[PDB]
Ligand binder design. Structure first.
Ligand code: MG
Ligand code: MG
Length: 351
């Protein structure tokens, strides 16, 4: 029967919300979608996405600047083919990929029927889904620019302390679980919440011994573990990982959605629900030429007015950037060199 990559390709071609799927099938297909990862795109691509499944199959999807879609599928038989896909109103393919697009509106998605926003777990679950869906590019101004103001990136290492062990993190699609993230925080030298990385890490990256230990705890085949190790030993791996946690990345998105942010906050207060103020989902990618790419997602709750059709949902902010060679893990270096791009979506719970 079909490989995972082939299953995912089918779901994407025909759309996750296809009438023939039951709720239970829709749920199972969403777990396949979790394997999709945004990666560094080629110069002619608006977005590139990659999934490597444990059955040995893989799917890489490229969207050209002209929104042409190509999907390279590798299946256990040794077969390797590139399929041409088209996005239409029926499949919502373009909407079902972790890519940024210019659009006249912030993209709206529907959550699966079983999703809710009761607690930490359910909120992290929703972000697990929305981090795989499309976002709309938003402009910043001097007021909302994460890279402007008196002290851009000043909170970065506290943000990293806050995020590690409390975030979804993948490196080349290899999930780094909570305990491995705590090891990673130690390896960076972030011993306490008011500290910055050790000088040795800044200059040489994470030690090979520390990198091995972190990769060991993580998912992945042995080859994929080697990928993670080689990534971690780069001085700019520390820059990538730390910079990804910046709390101010989503300020443009928060500003344009401030009423619905406020309504969600008031609604949860009123019925005493304990939800986090934000959830974090990060995918870092290094290409075989060594180029490092960060896609960082922050989800915050939103709620539409009572008289509007929707109720509770999530505002997802996607921040994308390259970490250039020679950018060391300091505030000044991040400010000097990083040039992020910002995009958002709104995803609402169903009836
Ligand atoms: Mg790679
Ligand atoms: Mg309403």
């Amino acid at each position: 029967e079909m490989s995972c990559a082939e299953k995912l390709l089918k779901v994407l071609s025909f759309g996750l919300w296809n009438p023939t799927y039951s709720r239970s099938e829709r749920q199972s297909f969403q777990e396949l979608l979790t394997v999709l990862e945004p990666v560094y795109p080629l110069p002619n691509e608006l977005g590139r996405v990659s999934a490597r499944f444990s059955d040995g199959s893989s799917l890489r999807i490229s969207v050209t600047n002209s929104e042409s879609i190509e999907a390279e599928i590798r299946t256990p038989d040794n077969e390797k083919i590139t399929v041409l896909l088209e996005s239409n109103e029926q499949n919502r393919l373009l909407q079902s990929l972790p890519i940024d697009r210019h659009m006249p509106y912030i993209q709206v998605h529907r959550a699966l029927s079983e999703m809710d926003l009761t607690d930490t777990t359910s909120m992290r679950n929703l972000l697990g889904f929305t981090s795989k869906l499309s976002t709309t590019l938003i402009p910043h101004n001097a007021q909302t620019d994460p890279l402007s103001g008196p002290t851009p990136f000043s909170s970065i290492f506290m943000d990293t302390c806050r995020g590690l062990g409390n975030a979804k993190l993948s490196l080349n699609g290899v999930d780094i679980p909570a305990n491995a993230q705590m090891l990673l925080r130690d390896a960076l030298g972030l011993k306490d919440t008011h500290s910055s990385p050790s000088r040795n890490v800044i200059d040489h990256g994470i030690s090979r011994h520390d990198a091995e230990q972190i990769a060991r705890e993580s998912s992945g085949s042995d080859n994929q573990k080697a990928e993670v190790v080689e990534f971690l030993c780069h001085p700019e791996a520390a820059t990538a990982i730390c910079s990804a946690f910046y709390q101010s990345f989503n300020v443009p998105a928060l500003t344009l959605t401030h009423e619905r942010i406020s309504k969600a906050s008031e609604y949860n207060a009123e019925r005493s629900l304990d939800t986090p103020n934000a959830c974090i989902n990060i995918s870092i990618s290094q290409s075989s030429d060594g180029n490092i790419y960060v896609t960082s997602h922050t989800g915050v709750l939103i709620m539409a007015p009572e008289d509007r059709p929707n109720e509770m949902g999530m505002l997802t902010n996607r921040t994308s950037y390259e970490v250039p060679q020679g950018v060391k893990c300091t505030i000044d270096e991040m400010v000097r060199a990083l040039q992020p791009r910002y995009a958002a979506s709104e995803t609402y719970l169903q009836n």
